[PDB]
Write a protein that binds this ligand. Structure first.
Ligand code: LPP
Ligand code: LPP
Ligand code: Y01
Ligand code: Y01
Ligand code: CA
Ligand code: CA
Ligand code: ZN
Lengths: 680, 504, 78, 23
């Protein structure tokens, strides 16, 4: 044998020539031929009414695909096995599914698929409304964090079916047409559904993209729903609705970035940000800088008026959120400026004083440290503990405050434990004064690096700062890989060099001086020398041995050279490849991320909790019924126009497929035969 | 036939394979479309390698065959059907067959991965729903008890304590915990926990090294069994297997040299006056190199993690691009090393110095010899070679200028040109690898997962050294299931996609 | 309870079976049926001429969407 | 989809009157 004898292996049962003509008449829309053949079948029992084409299409399915309502009615007049024809009509999005609804095995749909679930998948408003008008219900899925005995038992029996059924239910519930129809509050339903779908993607490692797409679709629906507001009164009603912008705060907690960054939503927020401050967005940039500078210089007098004279014209200026931000920023700059003055030695503090009294500059630095702690305490008071620890900057603030407390405690300890004359060069090296200065210096770095969080307010540094933060997570991933490589070579280099590098009597012991002696004596020294070789600060004589062991020296330098190639040529250049690719993904929708972050910064100054800056902070049924009606009224309009604008128009702008061409031939072919039948 | 008409023969062969690779023909006339698609994709991939021309056409045909198998498996709607298909053989025999055929899309199917995760976490419910802090705590305490779990497995088979280790997830944790203890012991060896002196020419093994030895024997013992239960072709396919062989070879040389030094040198001699080729010196050198390889083996464990997994796979797939520039850079490096050594080998014959080379404060002879020239040129990438290395004791400023210009030209080519060109590749390379990176990681994670499914390596490294009726029934139940899959695949993919085709 | 009882919350006012047929005739371009139904509306006051489909399309809007100038002229006659 | 929906209308408008004219 030299040829492949192709043969039918599975295929399907063949069709009689009469049956093939009968199905061909259904495809061609020949009503007279189909009616005659069906009448002959019920009187001669020759052909099978429920014959199946090679592609798996029966007579009813062919008529449904061509949307020949007359043919469907003719077939339904006889005893045609409907089977899953209703699902096929729903999937094909044929509005003439009413005939199958009120009409007194191998399936292309899973057994868990119901007409309502499939209708919601198709996102057809007319079909969904038709089914909901009748008796229709959807099985309710269990929570993401569920421990039901039935849930685990069902998954154990069939894991594939359980996952598919759960995905199908959530796909049906996430359809905007179903939410706009059967949901009491579609804005709240979309917020909760996106949260649940996002949690499912994290829990279900498989089908992560499907769940993420469903959550993104829910987030998009809420943004499109809010896009239908045409008056500022409607926007205020929706955003302030609660069961203060309570609904806007709810959207923030659900990470509805698209909803928050809506142009109308941002415009209203900017009005609250610049309340009673007209023309700020139209002034020159030089005027803006001058006005902000003079306002910031007068932050203490504004806080003094707020404390002394409430509800006063001078005390009402600070209540503006924009003025709060400027005054708070000006307070932080003064604190940072005082930190620079502390290192500048404005007042004499001597050098040999073991326990020094606090400097005059440090004396008025202390209220800011107490104010920062006082403000952080109130952050956990008015706000929830879950939200307090969510922010990354909150952890950074806690570290800075902890370092400041240790500095104050060590300064107090040194004051009350050391009161004798002793030159600095002959101290303990673990002196409380030395540790206090070290922790103060570290806290100064964190205090000055806190100004990055203020970049969100600016329109130019805002999107950049957010992008760098979102890209820092990629650096953390290479910290694991580099450290594993760093520890691998540090282990090898220390193992080789710890015999010879036992030299004593030198001025130094390590790498941090002119004569770098013991680069790989210990594991700690090996790690430092390997770390500093990235920047080229480790010379080549660190691999030398006093003994004339050139083979050991060559191996050590080759191991040092291999690390340099891997870390610098390979790892560093690989790191660049990620962040360049990472930014291309982050560059798009970077405005949405910044606007969401800027909104959170803006609403942090809306309330009265932190009106005072850091240094000076230490010194029903009828109304509820009315709001529900006015929210439902407004929401009725939004859903109605959303359906007309998005659901209807997008379907009209949909592209043309082969089914439409196949359809157009059927109407011509149906008009083809009866005109010939009528004329002849 | 090819000699008579090469163009016709190539076109005829491509047309035949294009016809055979059509999913409609496979779903119709093939006895086992899953096996036919696996074999056809393998054959088409081999043809692309052999036929340099029409490589894209053959690669597209193989990709189409791989896509058909993934779409065919996408039609399973019950877990019983998936188990029947994946366990079918002529253990997941069909899944293993797909792995050997590099059916990454077939392996990384969400339903296929879900069943594999169930086997990975068998009798361990709620692991995927627990908090990350709980996961870390549970893994840590389980890993700390790896010796007691292995002891129970050896002492008490089919016992409640001895059945916990049989879980593949527990095997991975216990094996990982075993490797970390071995790596921790390697750090202790360099930390000099016990006194080993310094002038002992032939030293007895340290107490720390005494219990290090079982791991080395266990690693060799486990590697031997890897070639026993598994095929030799599959044993050498894995890159990490070659890395393990190098690490084991270095450890054997260290043990052999330590034994040789013990039985050949037993006299007092300070270390600074040794041979420089002493067996103790070579043993320490090879032990240090093996320590680097042993600790770098932890990269292969990154595949299990969902975050470090795709990253690690991408870097490995990108390392091949670095190897391509190793040829180009070395050619440039050897070109300038030849020129610099030719110019500087007359003058740089100085003697009587403390040093001879570049690895000290006074870098004397950077280009005396070809070996020294290569080292000095290599170290100039990181800026560790100073500018006085191009100076001559003689007042030959023209020769010095030419040598520094040749040194300067190499620096521009290697750093400004070659290094920046290398960045351009990997940035473009990642953009290609960034897509379908999840499929590559999931395929690699699957191979790691099934490596713990069988009983071949249940014990960790330190403790490893201490019919017709049934066949007929399986064929019918596989064909039954396969009949349903093909029937619904034709209706869902072949029919519906044609209806959604564009209008011409 | 373990199932979600989907119900109509806002939707829109329902259509009479005669009104549904009247709008269906406008969509299908049946000039004779539309003219007869419109004539019956002005003599029997049974169906609403300005009935609205679930999607928010009235009889005039449906004819405009299909660009049936004859249907628009017929509707504008009444 | 509007163009396809349109093309059906002209056929459907020509559908009924020809039937009305013949019958
Ligand atoms: C996830 C990542 C994991 C790690 C992946 C690593 C992939 C492999 C990376 C390469 C490692 C092998 C090469 C190491 C060579 C070495 O250390 O070599 C170091 C030795 C050091 O010599 P001494 O010991 O005498 O100082 O150099 C020599 O012996 C002289 C010959 C040098 C030839 C070097 C050839 C390769 C250089 C590659 C540099 C590329 C620069 C590109 C821009 C100009
Ligand atoms: C596949 C790749 C193959 C190789 C391809 C090579 C392409 C050509 C690459 C450039 C080579 C020619 C330039 C070499 C100049 C040189 O060696 O110059 C080296 C000499 C060294 O002088 P000494 O000998 O006195 O030290 O410099 C001088 O004589 C003084 C004038 C310097 C002018 C340099 C102008 C070009 C510099 C390019 C640097 C670009 C830096 C960009 C970022 C800032
Ligand atoms: C050593 C001390 C004195 C600090 C020196 C630097 C500061 C003067 C700089 C550093 C970061 C700057 C900030 C970076 C970003 C912004 C946001 C941006 O805000 C606005 O445009 C106003 C609010 C808004 O409309 O959103 C411009 C001011 C501000 C606070 C900047 C004010 C000046 C700051 C604090
Ligand atoms: C000096 C010694 C003590 C080593 C120090 C570093 C180790 C403690 C680190 C380095 C790499 C880490 C591994 C990197 C990746 C993974 C995969 C990942 O696996 C899982 O999440 C569980 C399995 C799965 O579900 O796939 C997390 C654990 C593990 C083994 C990590 C365990 C801890 C390791 C071995
Ligand atoms: Ca804070
Ligand atoms: Ca191996
Ligand atoms: Zn439950």
């Amino acid at each position: 044998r030299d040829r492949i004898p192709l043969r039918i292996v599975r295929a399907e049962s063949e069709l009689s020539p009469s049956e093939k003509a009968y199905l061909n008449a259904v495809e061609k829309g020949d009503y007279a031929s189909v009616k005659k053949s069906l009448e002959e079948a019920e009187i001669y029992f020759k052909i099978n009414i429920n014959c199946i084409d090679p592609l798996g299409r029966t007579a009813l399915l062919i008529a449904i695909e061509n949307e020949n309502l007359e043919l469907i009615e003719l077939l339904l007049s006889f005893n045609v096995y409907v089977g899953d024809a209703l699902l096929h009509a729903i999937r094909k999005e044929v509005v003439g599914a009413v005939e199958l609804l009120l009409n007194h095995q191998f399936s292309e749909f899973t057994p868990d698929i119901t007409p309502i679930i499939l209708a919601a998948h198709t996102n057809n408003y007319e079909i969904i409304k038709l089914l909901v008008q009748k008796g229709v219900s959807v099985p309710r899925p269990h929570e993401v964090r569920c421990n039901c005995v039935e849930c685990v038992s069902s998954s154990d029996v069939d894991s594939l079916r359980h996952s598919r059924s759960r995905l199908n239910i959530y796909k049906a519930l996430a359809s905007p047409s179903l939410i706009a129809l059967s949901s009491e509050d579609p804005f709240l339903t979309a917020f909760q559904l996106s949260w649940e779908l996002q949690e499912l993607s994290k829990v279900e490692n498989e089908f992560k993209s499907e769940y993420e797409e469903l959550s993104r679709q829910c987030k998009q629906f809420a943004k499109d729903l809010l896009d239908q507001t045409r008056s500022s009164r409607e926007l205020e009603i929706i955003l302030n609705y609660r069961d203060d912008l309570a609904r806007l705060k709810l959207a923030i907690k659900y990470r509805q970035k698209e909803f928050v960054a809506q142009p109308n939503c941002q415009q209203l927020l900017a009005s609250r940000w610049y309340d009673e401050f007209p023309g700020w967005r139209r002034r020159h940039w030089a005027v803006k800088m001058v006005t902000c500078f003079i306002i910031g210089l007068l932050f203490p007098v504004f806080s003094v008026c707020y404390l002394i004279a409430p509800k006063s014209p001078l005390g009402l200026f600070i209540r503006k959120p924009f003025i709060k931000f400027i005054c708070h920023t000006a307070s932080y700059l003064t604190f940072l400026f005082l930190l620079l003055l502390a290192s500048q030695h404005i007042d004499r503090s001597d050098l040999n004083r073991q326990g020094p009294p606090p400097t005059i500059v440090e004396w008025m630095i202390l209220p800011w440290v107490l104010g920062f702690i006082w403000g952080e305490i109130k952050q956990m008071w008015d706000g929830g503990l879950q939200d307090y620890i969510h922010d990354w900057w909150n952890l950074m603030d806690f570290v800075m405050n902890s370092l400041y407390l240790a500095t104050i405690s060590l300064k107090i300890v040194a004051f009350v434990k050391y009161s004798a004359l002793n030159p600095r060069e002959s101290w303990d090296m673990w002196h409380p004064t030395l540790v206090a200065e070290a922790l103060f210096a570290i806290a100064n770095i964190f205090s000055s690096l806190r100004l990055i969080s203020l970049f969100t307010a600016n329109s130019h540094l805002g999107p950049l700062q957010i992008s760098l933060g979102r890209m820092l997570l990629d650096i953390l991933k290479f910290l694991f890989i580099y450290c594993l490589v760093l520890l691998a070579f540090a282990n090898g280099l220390n193992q080789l060099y710890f015999y010879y590098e036992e030299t004593k009597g030198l001025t130094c012991k390590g790498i941090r001086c002119e004569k770098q002696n013991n680069a790989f004596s210990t594991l700690f020294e090996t790690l430092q020398s390997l770390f500093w070789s990235i920047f080229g600060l480790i010379n080549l004589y660190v691999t030398n041995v006093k003994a004339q062991h050139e083979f050991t020296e060559f191996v050590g330098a080759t191991m040092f050279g291999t690390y340099n190639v891997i870390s610098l040529v390979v790892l560093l250049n690989m790191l660049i490849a990620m962040m360049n690719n990472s930014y291309q993904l982050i560059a798009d929708h970077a405005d949405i991320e910044w606007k969401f972050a800027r909104t959170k910064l803006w609403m942090s100054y809306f309330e009265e909790g932190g009106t005072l800056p850091t240094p000076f902070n230490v010194i029903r049924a009828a109304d509820n019924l009315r709001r529900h009606h006015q929210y439902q009224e407004v929401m009725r309009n939004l859903v109605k126009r959303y359906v007309a604008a998005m659901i209807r128009d997008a379907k009209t702008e949909e592209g043309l497929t082969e089914e439409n061409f196949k359809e157009l031939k059927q109407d011509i072919s149906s008009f083809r035969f009866e005109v010939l039948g009528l004329l002849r």
